[PDB]
Write a protein that binds this ligand. Structure first.
Ligand SMILES: C[C@@H](C1CC1)N(C)Cc1nc2ccccc2c(=O)[nH]1
Ligand SMILES: C[C@@H](C1CC1)N(C)Cc1nc2ccccc2c(=O)[nH]1
Ligand SMILES: C[C@@H](C1CC1)N(C)Cc1nc2ccccc2c(=O)[nH]1
Length: 330
C-alpha cells in the first residue's frame, strides 16, 4: 500500500503545515500537524475542556462506529515551545492520503495549553518520530507510520514541504519526479527517539563551506532552524543591523535587508536554503524589525533542522531495520 496527502501552510509565514486526516467511521476529517519530532497522534475532541476550544474541528468518538475506548490509558505531552496537552485514548481507523490503519491509538485531548487553543487551524498532531517516545501510559502505543509500515510497499515516508505553498507527505514510496539530482542518505541514531543525524557543515551565502559535524534532528513540527551559537552568529554577522534581542527572544534583522542563503551539508552533498526562507516577518504588526529563521540552539540542548531547513529539500525518512535519512535538492 501507499498514501499521498497534501500539506498546506497555516499562514503566510509557513509557521506550521496541516494535513487532512480521516478518523473513524463515518470519516471525521481533522487537519493535523505532522510532527517528525514527536510520537503521539492526538486530537481536539468532544472531551476537550470547552473553554480551551476556539474554532478547531473536533473528533467525537461516540459518533464513530469503529471507536473503542482504550481502557485505563492516559497521555500527557509537552513540546519544545512549552506547549502541552493531555487526555485519554481511543483506538479507531485512521487514513492519510488513502493509506488506512485500523486500531490506531487516537489520543483524545481533555486539556490543551493556550498556544493550542489560540491556533484555530491545527486540530491536533500526528507524531512521526520513533514509537519509543510515545507518552501513552501504562501501555505505550505505536505511531501511524509504525502501524502502517508492514503494509507499505517500502518502509518509508517522505516530506516535501513548500515555501509559501502546499507540499506533500507520501507514505510507502519515493516519488522520483519530486526532486532534482540524487538523494544522499545519511546515518540516523534512534537512541533519543528522534530522526537524529549529523550534518557535515555549513556555508553562509557565497562563502566557503566550513566542514564541521553538527548533530541534530529532522523535525517537521518545529518552524525554525536551530543551530549552535557559533554557526548562527556567523550567519547573522552577514546581515547589516542584525542582532540578538533578549526581549524578542532571538535574532532580529532590519526588514529592509536582503538575506543571504544558508547551506548545510549532507555527506558530500549540499542543501541550499534561499535567503527569503529565513525571513519570518515583522516582530509585531507595522514593525521594521523582522524575526530571523535561523536561531541559536544554545538553550535547547539539541540542534533542530526544522521547517526552514526541511522545506529546501525533498526528505526521505527511511524506516528500514536500520533507519536512515535522505536529502535531495528540488
Ligand atoms: C508563531 N509561531 C507559530 C508556530 C507554529 C504555529 C503557530 C505559530 C504562530 O501563530 N505564531
Ligand atoms: C533535549 C535536550 N530535550 C530538550 C528539547 N528537546 C526537543 C526535542 C524535539 C524538539 C524540540 C525540543 C526542544 O525544544 N527541547
Ligand atoms: C503546534 C505546536 C508545536 C509544538 C508542536 N505549537 C503550539 C505551535 C506554536 N504556536 C504558537 C502560537 C502563538 C505564538 C507562538 C507559537 C509557537 O511558538 N508555536
Amino acid at each position: 500500500s501507499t498514501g499521498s496527502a497534501t500539506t498546506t501552510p497555516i499562514d503566510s509565514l509557513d509557521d506550521a503545515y496541516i494535513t487532512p486526516v480521516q478518523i473513524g467511521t463515518p470519516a471525521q476529517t481533522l487537519n493535523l500537524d505532522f510532527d517528525t519530532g514527536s510520537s503521539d497522534l492526538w486530537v481536539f475532541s468532544s472531551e476537550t475542556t470547552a473553554s480551551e476550544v476556539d474554532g478547531q474541528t473536533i473528533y467525537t468518538p461516540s459518533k464513530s462506529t469503529t471507536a473503542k475506548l482504550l481502557s485505563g490509558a492516559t497521555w500527557s505531552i509537552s513540546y519544545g515551545d512549552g506547549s502541552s496537552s493531555s487526555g485519554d485514548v481511543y483506538t479507531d481507523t485512521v487514513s492519510v492520503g488513502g493509506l488506512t490503519v485500523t486500531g490506531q491509538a487516537v489520543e483524545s485531548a481533555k486539556k490543551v495549553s493556550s498556544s493550542f487553543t489560540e491556533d484555530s487551524t491545527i486540530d491536533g498532531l500526528l507524531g512521526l518520530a520513533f514509537s519509543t517516545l510515545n507518552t501513552v501510559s501504562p501501555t505505550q502505543q505505536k505511531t501511524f507510520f509504525d502501524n502502517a509500515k508492514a503494509s507499505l510497499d517500502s518502509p518509508v515516508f517522505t516530506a516535501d514541504l513548500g515555501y509559501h505553498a502546499p507540499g506533500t507527505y507520501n507514505f510507502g514510496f519515493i516519488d522520483t519526479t519530486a526532486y532534482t539530482g540524487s538523494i544522499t542518505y545519511t546515518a540516523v541514531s534512534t537512541k533519543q527517539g528522534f530522526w537524529e543525524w549529523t550534518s557535515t557543515g555549513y556555508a553562509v551565502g557565497s562563502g566557503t563551506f566550513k566542514s564541521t559535524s553538527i548533530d541534530g534532528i529532522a523535525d517537521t513540527g518545529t518552524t525554525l532552524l536551530y543551530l549552535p551559537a557559533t554557526v548562527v552568529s556567523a550567519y547573522w554577522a552577514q546581515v547589516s543591523g542584525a542582532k540578538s534581542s533578549s526581549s524578542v527572544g532571538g535574532y532580529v534583522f532590519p526588514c529592509s535587508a536582503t538575506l543571504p542563503s544558508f547551506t548545510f551539508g549532507v555527506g558530500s552533498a549540499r542543501i541550499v536554503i534561499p535567503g527569503d526562507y529565513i525571513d519570518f516577518g515583522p516582530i509585531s504588526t507595522g514593525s521594521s524589525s523582522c524575526f530571523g529563521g535561523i536561531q541559536s540552539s544554545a538553550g535547547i540542548g539539541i540542534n533542530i533542522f526544522g521547517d526552514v531547513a526541511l522545506k529546501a529539500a525533498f526528505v526521505v525518512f527511511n524506516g528500514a531495520t536500520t533507519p536512515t535519512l535522505g536529502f535531495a535538492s528540488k
